[PDB]
Amino acid sequence: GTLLQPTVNKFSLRVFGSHKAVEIEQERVKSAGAWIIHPYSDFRFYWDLIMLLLMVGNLIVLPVGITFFKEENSPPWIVFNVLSDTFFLLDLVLNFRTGIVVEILLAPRAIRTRYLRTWFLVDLISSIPVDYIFLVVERALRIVRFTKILSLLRLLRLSRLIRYIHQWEEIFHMTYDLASAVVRIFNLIGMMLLLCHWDGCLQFLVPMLQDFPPDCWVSINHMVNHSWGRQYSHALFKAMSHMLCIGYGQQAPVGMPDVWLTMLSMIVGATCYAMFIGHATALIQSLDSSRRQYQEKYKQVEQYMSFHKLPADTRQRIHEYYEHRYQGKMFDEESILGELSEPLREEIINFTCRGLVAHMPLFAHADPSFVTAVLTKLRFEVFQPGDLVVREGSVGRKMYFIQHGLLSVLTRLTDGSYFGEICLLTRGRRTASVRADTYCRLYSLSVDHFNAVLEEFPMMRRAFETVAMDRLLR
Amino acid sequence: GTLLQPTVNKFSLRVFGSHKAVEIEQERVKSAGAWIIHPYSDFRFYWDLIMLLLMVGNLIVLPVGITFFKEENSPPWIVFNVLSDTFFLLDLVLNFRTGIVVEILLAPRAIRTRYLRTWFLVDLISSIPVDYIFLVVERALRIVRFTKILSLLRLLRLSRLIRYIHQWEEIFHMTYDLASAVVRIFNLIGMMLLLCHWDGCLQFLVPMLQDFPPDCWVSINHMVNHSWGRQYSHALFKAMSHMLCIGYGQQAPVGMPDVWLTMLSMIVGATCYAMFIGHATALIQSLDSSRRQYQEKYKQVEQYMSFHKLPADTRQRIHEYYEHRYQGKMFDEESILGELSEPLREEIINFTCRGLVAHMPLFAHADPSFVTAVLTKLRFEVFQPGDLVVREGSVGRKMYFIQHGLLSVLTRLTDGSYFGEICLLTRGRRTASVRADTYCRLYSLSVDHFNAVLEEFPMMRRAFETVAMDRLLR
Amino acid sequence: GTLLQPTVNKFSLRVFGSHKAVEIEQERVKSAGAWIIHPYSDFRFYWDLIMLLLMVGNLIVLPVGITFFKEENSPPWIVFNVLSDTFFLLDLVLNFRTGIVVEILLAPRAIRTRYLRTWFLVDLISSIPVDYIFLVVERALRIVRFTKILSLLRLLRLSRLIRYIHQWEEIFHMTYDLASAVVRIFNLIGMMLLLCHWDGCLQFLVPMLQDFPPDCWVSINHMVNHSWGRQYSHALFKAMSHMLCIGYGQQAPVGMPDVWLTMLSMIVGATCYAMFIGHATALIQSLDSSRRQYQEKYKQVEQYMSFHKLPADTRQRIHEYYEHRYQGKMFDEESILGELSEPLREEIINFTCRGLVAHMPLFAHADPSFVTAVLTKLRFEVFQPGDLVVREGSVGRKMYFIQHGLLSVLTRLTDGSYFGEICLLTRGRRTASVRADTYCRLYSLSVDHFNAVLEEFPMMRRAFETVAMDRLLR
Amino acid sequence: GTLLQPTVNKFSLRVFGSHKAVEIEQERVKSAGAWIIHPYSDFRFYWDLIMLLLMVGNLIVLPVGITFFKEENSPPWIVFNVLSDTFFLLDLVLNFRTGIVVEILLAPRAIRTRYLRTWFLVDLISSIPVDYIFLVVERALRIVRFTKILSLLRLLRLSRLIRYIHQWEEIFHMTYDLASAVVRIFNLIGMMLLLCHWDGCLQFLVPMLQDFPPDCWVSINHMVNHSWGRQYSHALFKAMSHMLCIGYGQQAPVGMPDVWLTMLSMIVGATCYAMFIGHATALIQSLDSSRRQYQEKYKQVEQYMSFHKLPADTRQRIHEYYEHRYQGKMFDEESILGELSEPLREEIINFTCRGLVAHMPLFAHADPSFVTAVLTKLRFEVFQPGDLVVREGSVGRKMYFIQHGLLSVTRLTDGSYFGEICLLTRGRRTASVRADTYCRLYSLSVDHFNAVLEEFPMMRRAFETVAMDRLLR
Ligand SMILES: Nc1ncnc2c1ncn2[C@@H]1O[C@@H]2COP(=O)(O)O[C@H]2[C@H]1O
Ligand SMILES: Nc1ncnc2c1ncn2[C@@H]1O[C@@H]2COP(=O)(O)O[C@H]2[C@H]1O
Ligand SMILES: Nc1ncnc2c1ncn2[C@@H]1O[C@@H]2COP(=O)(O)O[C@H]2[C@H]1O
Ligand SMILES: Nc1ncnc2c1ncn2[C@@H]1O[C@@H]2COP(=O)(O)O[C@H]2[C@H]1O
């Protein structure tokens, strides 16, 4: 009895919010009882999965059954039509109690007026069997052709199929992350295949109603008395060749109703192929945008290089810097770390600098709170070999830690080491000079952040003082 | 008598400014009297709505009347031509007094020179009936063909139609918000349909003037003596098949003037179809850009994830954070709140936090000025379960309020609660530790903003002191 | 004698810099004398304008002269060929002394090696008349066909035409601001027209060399003995119909060399039409980008509106705010004013606020230096009616000036007025409350900027004190 | 013996990191011995370069050999098939020991399960010769047609070719900077040419198996007894004309299997041509984006100009300012200098201002450390002529240096400087400076100036002496 209520699911959590909002929605459904179908409930799922398959089966089978078969009084055809009319009438009956997303669950007022204003007439016309009525109520050939065109009123179920497919596609952008362009283009492919299947049946249907004049292509190809499969094959070939703008026959089409159907199918095919090109272009432009932005940024850089007329060796030095800095990846490290929360930043920086945790003895013994408080305030820097990181007699600004590479002070030291220590404490000038031997990834620490961390932790101040005196002894 | 002046309307307000600027424009119109038509006045509306319909009627009917009908001396055709010449001459007469937007309302100088420099000759040629003049002044078949080609000079009214349609489209981007690409593409569709309707009439017109040679397609299909409708149908089929690049006849076109018309229509159709593909692509790329930017941003995030070689569980934790933070929506909350004004921000934050207003007793009794002054300085934050928001023995930085979820301090508390209070007042370390039990939306308050609000309001300082002492008792 | 040197022009100033850099380049040219042609000099202009016209004339006329005419020994044809060979040999001779932009003006070393490495062979082959040599040196039909194919070596002048057209197009992005896509697409249109004109001549040329077999289309259409114009017309129709993917004949092409030419022209036409669609799409997407960014920004805003589930009246209030703030224009007022210089900002703000200059008596008497020093520090703000700008008992933050609209303090005041005065001086709370009656554009002044301007100007401090005492009297 | 290990190369450095990480990967390979092939090693290079050429040769030659030739028992055809089966079986054998990038080098567990889960069946089917088996085991015409369709199972080597081409293309985005769209579009061109070459062979193959009915196009064109080259030419013309949406014959195709092949090739050609248009559009939009952003920015500027209804002379003054400021180049000087490191900034500013170094005597004698410390804190500014840079009786804010142009206060040209004494005296502006031409200037802020004086005390006295000299002037 709870199947009319929306259950607790991932889409339910992402739409309603917490479990309490889901319970509020369930109580709003339970305001009335067995009169309201919530539009996110599993009953609408369990119904629409049936109705989509039935609608696809009818929209494929029904024109082939109308146009190509001669004796329309076969029993399983009548059984199939009766079943289709039954389910598509029960669908409207269940629609009457259903909810409407704009979620207006007011049953006696909003539902009835929203149907009678928007989408009751089309579903009502497509639901009921019109041809059986005129058969019961009622020059026989005009009557039979009239009943055939009336039986073509079943084709308005397409408008309901489109509505349910768009409701599904609005649902499954949220339970699964899907590229939008893929959904759009497979929707368009289904529409195009369906339209070509219509035009085949139509271009056989029109010479049927005129009792095959000698001007029509069926009489010219002498294929009146073949089986329905081969006639369907030739008609579909003709329709697809008009639709993809080919050029079908030897002669121009002579009969006047052939000309206008031809022109109609040509226009429809040209517009559908144009929209298909558009969707394919929009899909292709969204494949390697991360690599494309890197390309645009380097175009911008060499534009700036050209503006100041820089030398060639400097230009390739810049190029090597970008190749060993970004590695073809155009990411904004500031905004991504800004969009996150604090524990995510802590976990990321721990995973990136557990090597610096492991090699350094000062981080081996201290509290991990202190370790994270240091690590959250570093900055990643990359140097090229031959460069002097710190020159002697500087102002003194920053400390450095060593991720990779080895560095030479004119006394060499490899990765896992550190320098820039004592000049922050003594506040003096730079004692020795540090060179870059290779590409060396470094993390840097600002002095204001350093004093803030020392204000947060007094014992590591004495630890740095002891290791600075040891460094002075070295 | 005020219909020459621009009235007070929505476009009038968005162009001129206040009502006073509209009155200044009305006085500038009333500088002269019954000699100037302001280009935004309702008289130009009331005139152009007639003239567009007349121009469309002529540009559809006139070639069909020229080419297909034999006896051109029928009375209602002459009546129709006389009416068309009358209205399109009166249009030029009313153009003489009209205003010109660049609004140059100087009648005797700017209007006359701007016509005689830019667009007087084309309207003058398209206005007057040339063929009736040569009929009055004046081997009869060459004369009749000469009059037919002279009567084709009516087709230069297209240049006026384009000018008025662009003036309308420049108007209605401002009274109604319209997607620009839709306007462009329906303008192009109208142009393409009109060009195909020209080419049908033209490809029947050329074998008319040569008295139907046996090489032409009309003689080959033996359709000289059919009605004009069927001839128009076959000619339009031929023109559309050349235009959409199909391939029309059995043979190659034999007569030399057929070949060049064929090649001309093929080139025109290829270029029009190319521009149609371009407009369709530009329309499709502007449908789901909000969802596309979210996709690009997450591609950027997983690019950054790949750059530091993060583990899988961390990567899916980041993915869950974005799914429960942005919900597929790529919006910039900083810039949108920055572009607004202060009362809009106040109304938005009141509607988002009236729940926090309702549950908290401290906000229930105080002045709503104080309530808004608190609420404008919050920050929205989202945590994942298991995370520790405040760890014991911290520095003490911020207060938190609880939108959703429940939180556990190791003493549980659900939504509508608050914490982080006493550490701002005591300026000490963190007493207890707070965990996250679920996804919990929190609003955070900075201590500097907190002290500023206390400086603005002294009594709530004592209120916070009392509730902090109560919290210490707890 | 100075025509070899680059003169002082707009492109010369935008490339070289000042007049002194132009004189340095002129001295670098005058390092040698009458041996170097600078590539920006007017002599290269005066030469290339001739050579482009000659190259276009040859690339149009020469295949029509080779393929369609029978007697190739007519005198003016020989005169035309001798003139063409003369000018295209003199072009290579003048190329030897010319300069090369990469500007390497080193004549004996860089020019000779850069020709013999890159582009000497193609120009040498296309320069000299090959067929006259084999005619002087030398089954006559094989010899004549051999001379015809040798005379087709003139077609390599296309590579020189492309080089000079790209050098021109690189020049005229700088003297005139041109949309790049227009240049690209007209270059492509010229290339496509030229290729179709080649294929017409080629598809007549191949049945010439086989003495018109009965399998070829010329013999089938029985058009061997027509004039050259009609043969050229049918050949061009055949080539264009293959190129635009149409379908030409009744039968499939029977002869084997016809099939491969057909397939070649089909592939070339398909690729050219694809690139034409691409250029048209890229041109269309760059037309109304300013209006498109406004559309995307409002999509973003209503996305944010949907995220917090805002009410409808609030949503339309936001919509009215944007309509009366930006007017469909997506401009960044911060970055544009940031990119300018100081006197440009001063001139812009003077033109926007001379009304506030004129109505205010305090700005009427003071120094215009003081006036600009005030005006450069304002901020433009827009309010909706009913809003309260200043509520009584505020903290006191800012002064306001009134561009448009009228405002009511509960004592009304219209545009050109001002308020927010005395609370900056007294540093107290807000005395009276100000409402918004209409849309009212306001300029706001911050108190820190206000005190800075008072520090710059001491007498206007006393002026504000007097008018504040007058306001207190009011 | 080290060819199974990944050597020290540029891609190796850009993937692994330092030389030590390369040695760690080499030790991880050397965990086992002569049982593991590392997927970046030169042996996989030396193997795949052979296998791509063999796969292309087979995918071109084999359908032409099957469909058009009558006697399929010629010796060099059998030799060619035996060689192809040999190398494509040895490829699977060497695949068994190979590594897999996701680098899972675990040989007995990850490799076997990853093959038997993902890509063992297709390579196994495409490897072994099926037709020779049915020939050994086994109305002869049905048997021969059955063997022909079984010999068409060689065509599944395309799936391996695609995998190796994508592995190569993933490698060479890193050793060479390549535009991605060019790689995509040449991959698509190769695929389209291959598909058209398939459809030609197929549309001749189907009337072969029906012993040429009179309804087929071969019998209608009376070309059964021509050579194989001319038959291949007509079949390829028919296939390409269906593929590029042309319209081939006089009549509609009469036989029912012709109709469905026609419709299939038409659909395939339409989709391939659509994707080709898409790739061409995406390539064209990425050519002159630097010039396009300048265009969009100036559209934005004239939008702002229109919003405040500015006069024409002001608008063209703004236009001249942008033409002499950016020169059509839409670059962000802040972010580019921000993304670099400190020595790169120092080298760039030295190369841009060595003229100011050379003309100024105060920079001629001082330490180059001081020179760079001054030069890193300048700002580039551009003025229009007639403008007054400093008006008399100002507040006093900044110093200026002169890159180009000449300025009139007592005139002075490029290489000069002003704005000096008002920073020291902290007073108002003494004289007024005009702009005579377009003049590029570098500006110096007073807070940065006092910071540099705090870093260097002797140049303080140098500025004091030259300021007293300026007062004497
Ligand atoms: N043993 C050592 N090896 C290398 N550098 C050292 C040593 N001892 C001290 N230093 C210096 O200690 C300094 C601390 O900060 P500086 O940035 O001034 O530069 C650092 C190094 O040059
Ligand atoms: N009854 C309580 N339940 C939970 N937390 C409390 C309680 N009383 C005080 N606190 C703490 O009060 C602190 C105020 O600021 P903190 O951020 O230090 O962390 C807050 C809580 O841990
Ligand atoms: N005659 C007046 N009419 C309207 N407002 C006034 C008048 N005199 C003083 N004020 C107030 O002067 C105040 C100066 O700063 P406030 O922002 O506090 O708000 C301003 C006004 O409310
Ligand atoms: N000989 C001179 N020629 C030009 N300007 C000078 C001279 N001597 C001093 N100055 C001024 O010195 C001032 C220093 O800073 P100011 O920006 O006030 O403006 C500068 C100049 O106007």
Numbering used by the authors:
A (entry chain B), B (entry chain D), C (entry chain C): 50 to 151, 156 to 191, 205 to 476, 483 to 546
D (entry chain A): 50 to 151, 156 to 191, 205 to 475, 483 to 546
Paper's wording?
pmcHyperpolarization-Activated Cyclic Nucleotide-gated (HCN) channels represent a class of unique voltage-gated cation channel that are activated by membrane hyperpolarization and modulated by cyclic nucleotide and membrane lipids. HCN channels play a major role in neuronal excitability and cardiac pacemaker activity and have emerged as attractive targets for the treatment of various heart and central nervous system disorders, including heart failure, depression, neuropathic pain, and epilepsy. The recent cryo-EM structures of HCN1 (31) and HCN4 (32) unveiled a tetrameric topology, with an intracellular N-terminal domain, including the HCN domain, six transmembrane domains (TMDs), and C-terminal domain, including C-linkers and cyclic nucleotide-binding domain (CNBD), which contains the binding site of cAMP. To understand the mechanism of ligand and lipid sensing by HCN channels, we determined two cryo-EM structures of HCN3:ligand-free and cAMP-bound structures.
To investigate the conformational changes that HCN modulators induce, we performed cryo-EM analyses of full-length human HCN3 in physiological conditions which bind with cAMP. The overall structure of cAMP-HCN3 showed high similarity to the apo-HCN3 structure (RMSD = 0.529). The TMDs of cAMP-bound HCN3 closely resemble those of apo-HCN3 conformation, and the structure of TMD of HCN3 in the presence of cAMP was similar to that in its absence, indicating that addition of cAMP alone is insufficient to open the channel. The superimposition of a single subunit from the apo- and cAMP-bound structures shows that cAMP-binding causes rigid body movements of CNBD domains, resulting in a 10 Å closure of the cleft between C helix and β strand 4. Secondly, the density of CHS was not observed in cAMP-bound structures, which is consistent with the idea that CHS represents an inactivating lipid. In the cAMP-HCN3 structure, we observe a strong density that bridges the C helix and β strand 4 at the site where cAMP is expected to bind. The cAMP-binding pocket is located at a cleft between the C helix, P helix, and β strand 4, which together form the CNBD of HCN3. The cAMP-HCN3 structure reveals that the residue R543 on the C helix forms hydrogen bonds and cation–π interactions with the AMP of cAMP, primarily stabilizing the CNBD domain. The phosphate group of cAMP is pointed inward within the cAMP-binding cleft and is accommodated by residues R463, C495, and T503. Specifically, the C helix in the CNBD shifts 30 degrees.
